[PDB]
Paper text:
Co-evolution between cereals and pathogenic grass powdery mildew fungi is exemplified by sequence diversification of an allelic series of barley resistance genes encoding Mildew Locus A (MLA) nucleotide-binding leucine-rich repeat (NLR) immunoreceptors with an N-terminal coiled-coil domain (CNLs). Each immunoreceptor recognises a matching, strain-specific powdery mildew effector encoded by an avirulence gene (AVRa). The Bh avirulence effectors AVRA1, AVRA6, AVRA7, AVRA9, AVRA10, AVRA13, and AVRA22 have been characterised and are recognised by the matching MLA receptors, MLA1, MLA6, MLA7, MLA9, MLA10, MLA13 and MLA22, respectively. For both barley MLA and wheat Pm2a, co-expression of matching receptor–avirulence pairs is necessary and sufficient to induce cell death in heterologous Nicotiana benthamiana.
In contrast to the pentameric wheat Sr35 resistosome bound to AvrSr35 of Puccinia graminis f sp tritici (Pgt), we find that the MLA13–AVRA13-1 heterocomplex is purified as a stable heterodimer and resolved using cryo-EM at a global resolution of 3.8 Å. We observed that the substitutions MLA13K98E/K100E, located in the CC domain, impede effector-triggered receptor-mediated cell death, therefore allowing us to express and purify these proteins without triggering cell death-mediated protein losses. In line with the SEC results, negative stain transmission electron microscopy (TEM) analysis revealed homogeneous particles with a diameter of approximately 10 nm, suggesting a 1:1 heterodimer of MLA13 K98E/K100E –AVRA13-1 rather than multimeric resistosome assemblies. Local resolution analysis revealed that the core region of the complex, and importantly the interface between the receptor and AVRA13-1, is defined up to 3.0 Å resolution. More peripheral regions such as the CC, the NBD and the first and last blades of the LRR show resolutions above 5.5 Å, implying their flexibility in the purified state of the heterodimer. The overall architecture of the MLA13K98E/K100E–AVRA13-1 heterodimer resembles a single effector-bound protomer of the pentameric Sr35 resistosome. AVRA13-1 adopts an RNase-like fold in planta reminiscent of the crystal structures reported for E. coli-expressed AVRA6, AVRA7-1, AVRA10 and AVRA22 of Bh, all of which share a structural core of two β-sheets and a central α-helix. The higher local resolution of the cryo-EM Coulomb potential map of the interface between the MLA13 LRR and AVRA13-1 reveals interactions of the effector with multiple receptor residues, specifically from the concave side of the LRR and the WHD (4A and EV3). Visualisation of the MLA13–AVRA13-1 interface clarifies that the two basal loops of AVRA13-1 (AVRA13-147-74) play an essential role in the interaction with MLA13 and receptor-mediated cell death.
Residue numbers in the entry:
A (entry chain A): 2 to 131, 143 to 541, 555 to 956
B (entry chain B): 25 to 122
Write the structure that this text describes.
Amino acid sequence: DIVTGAISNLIPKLGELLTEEFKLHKGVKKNIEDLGKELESMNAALIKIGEVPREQLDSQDKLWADEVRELSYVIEDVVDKFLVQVDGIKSDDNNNEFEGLMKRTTELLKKVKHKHGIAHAIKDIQEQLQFVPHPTRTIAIDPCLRALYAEATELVGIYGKRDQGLMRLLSMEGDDASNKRLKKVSIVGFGGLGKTTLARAVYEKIKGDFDCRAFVPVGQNPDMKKVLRDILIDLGNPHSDLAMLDANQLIKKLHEFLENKRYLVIIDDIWDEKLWEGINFAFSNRNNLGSRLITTTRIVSVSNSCCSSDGDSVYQMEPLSVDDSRMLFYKRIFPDENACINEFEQVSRDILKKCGGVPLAIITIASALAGDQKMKPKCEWDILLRSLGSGLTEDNSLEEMRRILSFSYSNLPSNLKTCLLYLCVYPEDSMISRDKLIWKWVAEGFVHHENQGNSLYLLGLNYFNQLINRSMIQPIYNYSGEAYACRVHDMVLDLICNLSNEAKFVNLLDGTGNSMSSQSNCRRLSLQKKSMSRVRSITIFPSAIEVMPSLSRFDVLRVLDLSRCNLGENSSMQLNLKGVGHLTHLRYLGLEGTNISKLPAEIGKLQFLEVLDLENNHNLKELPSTVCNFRRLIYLNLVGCQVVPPVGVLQNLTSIEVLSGILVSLNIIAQELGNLKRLRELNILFNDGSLDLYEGFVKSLCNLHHIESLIIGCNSRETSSFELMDLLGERWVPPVHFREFVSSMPSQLSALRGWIKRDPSHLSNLSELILTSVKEVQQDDVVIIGALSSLRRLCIKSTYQTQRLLVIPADGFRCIVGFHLDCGSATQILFEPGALPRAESVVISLGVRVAKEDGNRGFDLGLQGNLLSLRRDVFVSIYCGGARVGEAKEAEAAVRRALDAHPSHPPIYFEMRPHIAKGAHDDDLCEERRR
Amino acid sequence: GYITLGMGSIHKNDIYRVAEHMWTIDAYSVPSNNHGSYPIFGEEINGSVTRIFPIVYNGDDWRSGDFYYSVESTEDLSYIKLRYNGARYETCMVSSPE
């Protein structure tokens, strides 16, 4: 948990300080020697005491609430001071004061454990207790996960749109006295049964029989001002501007619109219980016309208060069968074969009767069994079993299903608990980029620095995959099948928020501030619309800029985020960066998207930064002439900014692992490029070109043995030079784990063939290859590219083409998701039957051919009974090359005929580049030339 | 003279040139880090076809990288829309030049 996590990282930290700094001072080292032994004993003792819950430690837990948690901060306040400031100010006497508190804590551990009844594990501690950037790829996202979520979203559709019973209870069958009375029916269900989708079917299919209609969500806002404003928009029709209104007058406000009007409104996604009565009061008593009010809710007890009157009815979605539920469960664990555990298999299914077999509870328990492989005997049958309530009809509220999500939370291994809790600072249903989140975990320090000298980013990536693995965060895929964003489930957000506000880990401001002081310590604040010197993490979203204090009043701050905000050089907040000097502890200064005028001259005085993200700033032109003390930074992103690097300012920056967006002038590419031995990703832009510049770039790149991503581009309009690509292919050899290669410069595939037969370890990690200026694509070139075992995205263009045809072999391209071969007028493309097993999108061009078949034939590609896995659009160009319009029109129809019996029905598009679209005369007598 | 959306503001006299230049370049010619190659054909309104091409926050042209804005238009500068991926989809209509 939090108490052990915050302290478990200081032991390696101060151990490194002894190795790096404290070895110089013999007197201090002896004092820190006492500090080291007590910390090793104390934190390990807390782990042993960690079996006992925090709240039972009245002496200790309240002491975090008073001293220890602040002691873990004031120590960290001087630990970060030890490196530079204490090295200059010599604040040794502070250590004597603190070690006394730990000595009392050591005495407390001897006493508190003895008094509370815990085993005396202080003297028992002596008896019982006692280079490479890639440490270990812990896990990748399970391939079976993508298909499992696909079926679940498709399964909810079938189990939706079954409102035959729902229509029966609507009482809208004919004419009756009961039909003339008000009948407000409420529907309730679990979190995932899919009643929200179903409620639309009645709304759409009943439009004709009803004069007016309405549908507006409520969300997780327990307020009446928002819902009344939303309701009045579409009562039966728009009613002009009614923003300035009161809740009390809503009785009259709805009176002037529906005093005797047949009203049909639907309110969905509500967590409020008394709202039903309030609108009912505004709807008066039962009328004599006949109207229906349908409301859905995920909380039965809330809906019970909403639906507790005579005539009203409750309708809930059934559990997902007993046979169809096994499909969503047996796929995640045993993809191929299993006949060993069936009694435990079946009895674990019946456990879900507490919810009945709802989709959310099935995935959360199932995936906890297998993280990367199968597991030992479960033993879960003795903990949760059946005795945990019975929510078929009465415990289905936040009494039983909450416990199921709570059980999986406590089985997460150690450090993942603190990482998951941090996601509370984001709003509902937000988009969380993978790169931004991981680079923030490192800044605060939630990744244990294991193996002493490995990249923190890779270890952080391992944590994110494991969270994706079980159930905690839902992936959002992209082209070539990768997870570049994540989402949090609705109910899981509730569990995180309640657990976070109990331990006061993160404070969320609703928009008016929180009265937290003294005992209610403010530690990490998230802002979504004195005595605050103890804050150490502030985050602002681009809707609450108007409410923020100046930057001067901060002294221990660590993380400052202003992404997408309006800091810039506009508005009326006086938000100039001047005054950033008194912030000599920062670890994350993210000015992601503000219109920054000039970087402050004192920015270099903060010799502790690790990440600096200027993701987009058009008017930024120069870095300050003081960036030479930053020897602890890993991130530097400069894309979207036209900045010229100063001379001799980049050499002593020897901590980089990623650099995105720079230029080259004379020798910066050689004098101060090979020294950075820790660089892993490189993104560069070239302005001019000559042999005295490319030679320097190639020589430096040979000394970077730990590079895995490379991107090269050109800025000048003229690109007649072929020098850069040919020089790179003759000397440089790729490393063992090279991943990405993107280039827009003119290139040749003879150079790529050279790298293949030079590397001792053949290219087995190059997952992408983007080339937009290739000249020649020969038959021997396609086979070599098709033999790579990890390629996932290819895009090659062609110019000055001189070959007549190309074929894609059946035994070849294997893990390809995107194919973008678009050679010119020549090179008729003929796909080998039954190829590209996993392709999801293709683009292919064809031309006039001729001289290929003796007789006049319709233009035929290979597409009949081929590409059995297409999902998204398919694109085929068309080139005339001085041909007949009738032939071109035939080519358009011929291609569309083949992809019509495809048993997936993907969309098909076409585009005629020479723009044949004209007055449309068939006997056009040739159209144009290649231009 | 602006168009407001989820979190940004784009000056009106720049969306027009993006809607026009996208009908002179080739189709599926500019690759992207995510999503795919652009411009992409869209659904049909009042006949003809539509195209989509990304735009940047300030309003300049987009060459490569990542984007969260898009412009969809027809080949008359009559039906024009602004698209925002961001947190959630949000669509606004664009008036026509006169």
